[PDB]
Amino acid sequence: AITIKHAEGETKLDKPAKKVVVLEWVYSEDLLALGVQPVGMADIKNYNKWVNTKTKPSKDVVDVGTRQQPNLEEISRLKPDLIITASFRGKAIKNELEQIAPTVMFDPSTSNNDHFAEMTETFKQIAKAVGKEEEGKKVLADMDKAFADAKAKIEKADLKDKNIAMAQAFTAKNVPTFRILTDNSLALQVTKKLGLTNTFEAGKSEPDGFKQTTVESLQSVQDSNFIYIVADEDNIFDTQLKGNPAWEELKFKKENKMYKLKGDTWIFGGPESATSLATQVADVMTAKK
Amino acid sequence: ITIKHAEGETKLDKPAKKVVVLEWVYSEDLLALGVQPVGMADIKNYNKWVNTKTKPSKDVVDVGTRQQPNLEEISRLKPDLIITASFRGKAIKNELEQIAPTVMFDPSTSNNDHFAEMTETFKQIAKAVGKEEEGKKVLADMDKAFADAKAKIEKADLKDKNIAMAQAFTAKNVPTFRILTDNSLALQVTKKLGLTNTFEAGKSEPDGFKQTTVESLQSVQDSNFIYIVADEDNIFDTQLKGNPAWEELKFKKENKMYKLKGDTWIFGGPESATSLATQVADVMTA
């Protein structure tokens, strides 16, 4: 009678789930980190393209459909014993998914935001729901060593400016869009473990961990280091900015304080995405010393 | 002439006569007074998305996108005065002042409350061009247009005067909603028409809205829903015509939804504001 505490409260499970359906990428990456293959999964194609962690979904999992509109018909057809989704897009159809199986719902702002705290608590609660409580802390102890070795390269390769600003970038309706992350976000919570300091919007936190805006907002952090992920086909990203003085004459671009990570890095992911981000930051920024 | 704008102060020795506009709300402000700019950004869908009744002639020349106006053409226009948003001009502020006196506004100078900054930017632009008397005209007609509106919604009494407004469109083919907040220009207008917004209540977004998806509409399920599709219409009901969390919304299957016209630029000036008023009062009563 294992007991799962999630955002929307409590859902008891008789036995650890073996046939599980995941309706968000973070929760899917969590189950795959625990060596558990789902039975259904939303948006697998663009998960393999944009999350792209080391434990990929197997072909035996079916595409449930879009994360926006899960195909309720073919969730039931698989008779899962546990459904995991975000409470944001779960309460929308909570009764309709609870009637297939016990349903658990997590929300990134469950512990004063701190999306890293909520990321780990949700990841362990999923390990307990799946019976992989020991495979859980191995995955998480591995991430703690990774944040240590990343921090190690930051001090033996010394720089003065510990200041950085991070953004996830894409193109939307033909304008380069920036999700500039704030203190409470998971990705900047990782960078703080490496001794870095985010300069975007100070002690202000946004409940979703970023501000979605345009290149014009980059002026306020233009003196810091810029780390960004282009989670879109980036050939258009530069083309829409290559003639733009808001982008070209930005101070960290002139001083080559720009560090473009790979678009592969899903900053809203779980433990495998947090390790990859950490060691990516340590290697791009300590490539000069 | 000395003006007051978001990025400091500027002084015009003579009332402006040869103006370049880089944002639509200030285009509408400029045209609503009877003064034609010499250059303006993005005419075609400006006339499509704002579609102000005083239209820009072909005497005005398109100096590029609001996002990136190719500043060579604006230079060869030798303007009397340049208007843009401080948000869009801060990155290039230097390059403009090399060309002509540049002044820049931002919806936040009135501690947001985007209605207050709109009308005050209007009077400041009126003082710049020297058409202060026309300014009083356009503003007074607006307050009256608000009164007839405000009067119509009570000649038919109503209880659930809770509204929720949103600008909607598709993005990465996800139905996206710009659900407006209490300090937006739009909700300040309906506030004085007798309606009360229910989305995020006593909270202020500096943008006057929150960009989100369908799921956020549950928070204002019990209110009246007012929206404008800033996107081609058949595209709008892209993924919602059969989508729960849109179907089981209380205001839908009870048809407490009222759809404004697509060319209702809720981020515009006084005439866009009046148009908002009389529209809401129209479809609310219906």
Curated annotation (Swiss-Prot), chain B:
Gene from which this protein is expressed: fpuA
Lineage of producing organism: Bacteria, Bacillati, Bacillota, Bacilli, Bacillales
Species name: Bacillus anthracis
Role summary: Part of an ABC transporter complex involved in ferric-petrobactin uptake.
Gene Ontology CC terms: outer membrane-bounded periplasmic space; plasma membrane
Compartment(s): Cell membrane
Name of this protein: Petrobactin-binding protein FpuA
Keywords carried by this UniProt record: Cell membrane, Ion transport, Iron, Iron transport, Lipoprotein, Membrane, Palmitate, Signal, Transport
Main location: membrane
Subunit structure: Can probably form at least three ABC transporter complexes, composed of two ATP-binding proteins (FpuC or FpuD), two transmembrane proteins (FpuB) and a solute-binding protein (FpuA), or composed of two ATP-binding proteins (FatE), two transmembrane proteins (FatC and FatD) and a solute-binding protein (FpuA).
UniProt membrane topology term: Lipid-anchor
